A paper describes a structure:
Reversal of PARylation is predominantly carried out by poly(ADP-ribose) glycohydrolase (PARG) in nucleus and cytosol, whereas ADP-ribosylhydrolase 3 (ARH3) may play a role in mitochondrial PAR degradation. PARG comprises an N-terminal regulatory/targeting domain and a C-terminal catalytic domain. The mouse PARG catalytic domain has a bean-shaped structure, with the active site in a deep cleft in the middle on the abdominal side.
Numbering used by the authors: 444 to 514, 525 to 936, 939 to 956
Write the structure that this text describes.
Amino acid sequence: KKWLGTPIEEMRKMPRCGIHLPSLRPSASHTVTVRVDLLRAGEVPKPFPTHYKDLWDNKHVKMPCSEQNLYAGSRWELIQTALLNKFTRPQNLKDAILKYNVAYSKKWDFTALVDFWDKVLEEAEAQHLYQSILPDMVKIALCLPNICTQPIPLLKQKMNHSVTMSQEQIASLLANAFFCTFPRRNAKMKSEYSSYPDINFNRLFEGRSSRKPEKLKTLFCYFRRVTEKKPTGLVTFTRQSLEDFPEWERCEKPLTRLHVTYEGTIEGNGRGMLQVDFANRFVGGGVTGAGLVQEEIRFLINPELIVSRLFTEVLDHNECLIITGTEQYSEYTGYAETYRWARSHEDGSEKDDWQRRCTEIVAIDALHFRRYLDQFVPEKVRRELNKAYCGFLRPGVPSENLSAVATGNWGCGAFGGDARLKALIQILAAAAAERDVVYFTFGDSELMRDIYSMHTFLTERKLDVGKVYKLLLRYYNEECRNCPGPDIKLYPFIYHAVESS
Ligand SMILES: Nc1ncnc2c1ncn2[C@@H]1O[C@H](COP(=O)(O)OP(=O)(O)OC[C@H]2O[C@H](O)[C@H](O)[C@@H]2O)[C@@H](O)[C@H]1O
C-alpha cells in the first residue's frame, strides 16, 4: 500500500479552489514592477515605468546600473566594457568578472567553472555556451536598466509587503548575479547587507566539488530557455510577518484531512498545492555555494526563487516568504552528492488572472538542533507551530479557497528534527489555518503508517488542537524533563495517555 488517508483527488488544489482575484495594482504594501493595464496572456509584460528611475538607499536594492555605483568612475560602464568582450576560454569570463571586482581577484577561485567548460562539457556544447548563451546572457544583463526600471524595495524584517515582477525582469537580475555585478554584496565585515543572503554567484565557481557542474548545468538550462524564448508570466514575492499567534493550549479548532504517502515528492506530486520549502533563515540556503539539499534543489529547478535573495532579509521567528508563480525549468535525479541534472522540464501549469503560474511555494525555516531532545521543550514546540502556522496562514482568505499543504519531513535532515513530532506540529499548524495536509515521507514507509495511525487515532477521539498540544506539553514534563534517553517515544505515549482516561 503506497498511500494512506483521504485520496489526493479530493484535496483542494489551484486554480480550481482559487478566489476571484482583485485587479492587480500598486499600493503602499504592494510594489508592481509592470504595466497592469497592458498585462496579457502569452505576451511579455511591459515594465513600469518606461524609463529607468534610480534609488540608492537603505530601503531599496542597490542596482548595478545606478549612476551612484562608482569605482568619479562609473562601475556600470566598467561592467559593460568588461562583459562586451568575446569569451573563447574560461579565463576570459574570470578576468571579465574580476575587472569590476578587483578586491576579490585573489579570493575567488574559478576552478569549478574551468572544469565544467573544458572537461564535463563536450566541444559542441562548450562552443554553444560562448557563442549563443553567454553573449545572450550579457545582453539581458546589460538590458537591466531598460527592464528593471522601477527600484526594488528590500523586504526587511517586520515588513508585510509584496513585490510582483515579470519573469523577464527576474531573468535580467539573475543574469547580473551570475556575472557578480551587484555592488556591496561580497564583503565579509559587511555593511548594509550582513543580514541578507549572498546574491552574486561567485561561490558557484569555487573548488573541486563534483556537484558544482550539475548546478551549472541546471542554471544554464534556465539561462538558455529565457534567452532563446522570453517567458511572459508574473511572480509575486510576499513577506508575511505575524505579531500575534494562537494560544495553542486553548485552541478549539478541529484537525483537518490528511493524505500521506512514501511515494513522490512535494514538487512532483503536490501540483497546484501550497508547497513547503524547508528553508534556512537566509532564504535559499547555500544555493549559490555548497548546499544541495531540498531547498537548494528547489531553488535550482525553480531558479526564479533565487532572486528572492537579492531583497529578502533574514527571516525572524515569526516570518515566512511566500512565492507564487515560479516556473520549473529542469528535472533532477538524485540528492545532495548524488544530485544530477536530468532533462529540461516543460511546465504546463495554468496561470491565474494575474498571469502567475499556479505554483505557490512558502519558505519556512525549522530550527537546527544540536541535540535530539531539545525539540520537545514547549518553547521549541511553540516556535515551530508558529513558524508553520505563519507559513500556512492566509489572513482574510476563506478556507474553502485555500489549497491543501504539500509538505514533508520539515527540519528532519540537515536540521536534526524528529519526523514524528514535526509531522504532528504541521498537522496542528494546518488545522489552526484550516488547511488540509498532503505529507511526503520520502521513502520511509513506517513513518507513513505511524503518522496515518496517529492522525486516524486523534480524529476518532475528536481532539481539538488544544488537547493535542496539551499532550505534547504533558510528554515533555512527564517523560522528557526528568530524563539516559527518554523511556517512551512520543507516539506510544499519546496512545497510552488518551486510552488511560
Ligand atoms: N523533494 C522532496 N520532497 C519531499 N520531501 C523531501 C524532498 N527532499 C527532501 N525531502 C525530505 O525532507 C528532509 C529535509 O531534510 P532537509 O532537505 O535537509 O531540510 P531540513 O529542514 O532538515 O534542513 C534544511 C537546511 O538545509 C538546507 O541547506 C536549508 O537551507 C537549511 O539550511 C529530507 O531528509 C527528506 O526526508
